[PDB]
Design a protein around this ligand. Structure first.
Ligand SMILES: [Cu+2]
Length: 98
């Protein structure tokens, strides 16, 4: 399992780390750090076919400080995802599942 802080302590709205590599079946914990509310809307494109992004997409917004979203990715492949509220600011990421 690996943990992604949503936003740096400085206030910058970025996925930390932006490019994360995990193994098949590892859980990603997206812990709110700064800039909340945040959400994780996996992109339908640039992903394993079948639009699995929607099922693993966080439509709701994490608002409480330290709120953690835990998602298990078993399918191998890059997952290109982005934070909608800060999508224009470049708050995106990619999770290589092997
Ligand atoms: Cu954000």
């Amino acid at each position: 399992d690996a943990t992604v802080k949503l936003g740096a302590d400085s206030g910058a709205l970025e996925f930390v780390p932006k490019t994360l590599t995990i193994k098949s079946g590892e859980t990603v914990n997206f812990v709110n750090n700064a800039g909340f509310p945040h959400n994780i809307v996996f992109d339908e494109d640039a992903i394993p076919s079948g639009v699995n992004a929607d099922a693993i997409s966080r439509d709701d917004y994490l608002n409480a400080p330290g709120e953690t979203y835990s998602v298990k990715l078993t399918a191998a492949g890059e997952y290109g995802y982005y934070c909608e509220p800060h999508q224009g600011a470049g708050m995106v990421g990619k999770i290589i599942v092997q």
